[PDB]
C-alpha cells in the first residue's frame, strides 16, 4: 500500500525483539535470585532459621 519502503516491514525486527525479550527475562531471573539470596542472608545473620 505504501509508496515507499517503510523500513519497518510487515515482519518485526527479530534481532531487536529477541534482545529486548532476553534482557527482560534476564533481569527478572536476576531479581528473583538476588531476592532469594537476600532473604537467606538476612535469616542467617539474624538467626531466624
Amino acid at each position: 500500500k505504501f509508496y515507499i519502503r517503510e523500513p519497518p516491514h510487515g515482519s518485526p525486527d527479530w534481532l531487536k525483539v529477541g534482545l529486548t525479550l532476553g534482557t527482560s527475562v534476564f533481569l527478572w531471573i536476576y531479581l528473583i535470585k538476588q531476592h532469594k539470596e537476600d532473604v537467606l542472608e538476612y535469616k542467617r545473620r539474624n538467626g531466624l532459621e
Partner: protein
Amino acid sequence: LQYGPLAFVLGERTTRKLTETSKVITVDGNICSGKGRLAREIAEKLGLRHFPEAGIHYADSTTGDGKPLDVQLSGNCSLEKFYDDPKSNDGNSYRLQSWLYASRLLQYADALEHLLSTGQGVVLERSIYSDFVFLEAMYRQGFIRKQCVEHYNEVKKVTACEYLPPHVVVYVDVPVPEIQSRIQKKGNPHEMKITAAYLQDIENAYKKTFLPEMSEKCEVLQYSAREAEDAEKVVEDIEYLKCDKGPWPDQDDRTFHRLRMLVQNKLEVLNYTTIPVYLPEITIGAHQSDRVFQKFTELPGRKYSPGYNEDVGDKWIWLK
C-alpha cells in the same frame, strides 16, 4: 541504518559519490511551453532522475500511497477557479500560490536528498528560485494584495537560503502570441481565460529578474522554441559547460553533511511555511481546523505511523 552523525563519523562521505554528472538541472519556461518534454529528454539522455512539476497534490504522491487526497484535506485551493475567478474574495489565489511554493520546496528537498544519497543527477521543471514570477504576475494583475507578497517574501527568505541553487538553468523562450495560439489549440476551457497581460507579466518577471540573477550563480542556457525540439543538441551543449563559478565547488564533507541532514526530515524542511502570520487568505479558524484534522486522521492509512495501520493490512503490530 538511518543517516546521521554516526554514519558520517565512520565511512559515509558525500564528496566521493559525485561523479561529474551530478549537475542539478532545472528547465524553466512560460505557460504552455514545451519545457516538460525537454526536461524528460535531458533526463533520458544524461541518465538523471526526472521530477515532474510539483502540483497541488505533490506531497500526496510521496506519503501513504501515492494517490492524491481530497482537495479539502490537501491543498485547499484550486487552479481552475483561480482561472475562472482570479479576484475571488475568498483568498484562493494567494492560498494556491503559497501551497505551490511549499510543494516546490518539498520537491527540491526530495531531489537534493536523492542526489546526495545516490550521486545520481536530477532534472526539475521549476523550483523555489523560479516560483516568484507567478507571484509577481499575480500582484501586477491585482489578483493578490501587497501583504501577501510580503508574507511570501518572508517565507522564501527563511527557506530558500538553506539549499544550493541548481548547477545549470535551462530556459525555453516562447513569444506570448504563440503561447496564446498553443493554449487555444489545447482545448482546456479554464486556460482560455488567461489574458495576455498575465503571460506578459510572467515573461517580464522571468527575463528581468530570474535569468539575470541566476546568471551570476551559474551560466544560463537559453533556447528558442524551434531549437528545443532537438534535444540531443541541447544535451551536448550541456555536456560542455565549465561549472566552476558557483557555490557548488565551495562544498566539502561537513557542509554536505549538514545539507543531507536538512534534506531528510521533511518536517524541518517545512518548518517555516506555517509561521504565525495571520493573513486572512491563509488563516483557518479553530473550528474548521479541528474538523478538517479529524477528517484527515480518519483516512484509511493515516491514523498511526506507516507500519502500524492494521486497517490497510499491517501485520505483527504487537511486536513492532
